[PDB]
Write a protein that binds this ligand. Structure first.
Ligand SMILES: *[C@@H](C)[C@H]1/C(=C/c2[nH]c(/C=C3N=C(/C=C4/NC(=O)C(CC)=C4C)C(C)=C\3CCC(=O)O)c(CCC(=O)O)c2C)NC(=O)[C@@H]1C
Length: 156
């Protein structure tokens, strides 16, 4: 898929921007499961887009909220998962993939929410400057605009 090529390049691009270890792009399914279709990670960590992904327990967040906050267009910034009071159930999943600090950005493409962008890297109780958060939400928007162009010019 030519569109996937763009995603795979964008994941790597934004990974360098926020100095993340891995960047996963979810795709909101019509059933709101939201699977990771494109992801990139440094060769020294673990991947996400793999058929051999073993998680402590399977968890979809996207159906329960059905986009919710992210569908509303609000960003979510997590300085630390133990600090904000995250669910221990999700924390165990997060820490299993070295996720202690992260920022959630919704990827609108077209008229509605297409995917989800996850940026993080073994930071712990770090901070996210708004000037860097706006850039991440900018990448998602730019991707959505591109995605629209590729949607037509792809043809069948
Ligand atoms: C414990 C897991 C119960 C639960 C809680 C819960 N989950 C979220 C948010 C997300 N969970 C995601 C799932 C995965 N799977 C992976 O392999 C992976 C890579 C590390 C992740 C992140 C997921 C993508 C999200 C969305 C990102 C987000 O944090 O919103 C939340 C949010 C609040 C919190 O406490 O973290 C909750 C409450 N969900 C279940 O299904 C379990 C019963």
């Amino acid at each position: 898929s030519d569109v996937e090529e763009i995603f795979k390049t964008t994941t790597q691009e934004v990974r360098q921007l926020l100095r993340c270890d891995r960047v996963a792009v979810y795709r909101f399914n019509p059933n709101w499961t939201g699977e990771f279709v494109a992801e990139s990670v440094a060769h020294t960590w673990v991947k996400l887009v793999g058929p051999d992904i073993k998680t402590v327990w399977e968890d979809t967040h996207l159906q329960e909220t059905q986009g919710g906050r992210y569908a509303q267009g609000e960003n979510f910034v997590v300085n630390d998962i133990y600090q904000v009071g995250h669910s221990p159930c999700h924390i165990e999943i997060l820490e299993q993939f070295e996720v202690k600090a992260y920022v959630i950005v919704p990827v609108f493409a077209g008229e509605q929410l297409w995917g989800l962008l996850a940026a993080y890297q073994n930071s712990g109780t770090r901070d996210w400057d708004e000037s860097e958060v706006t850039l991440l939400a900018r990448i998602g928007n730019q991707l959505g605009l591109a995605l629209q162009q590729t949607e037509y010019l792809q043809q069948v």
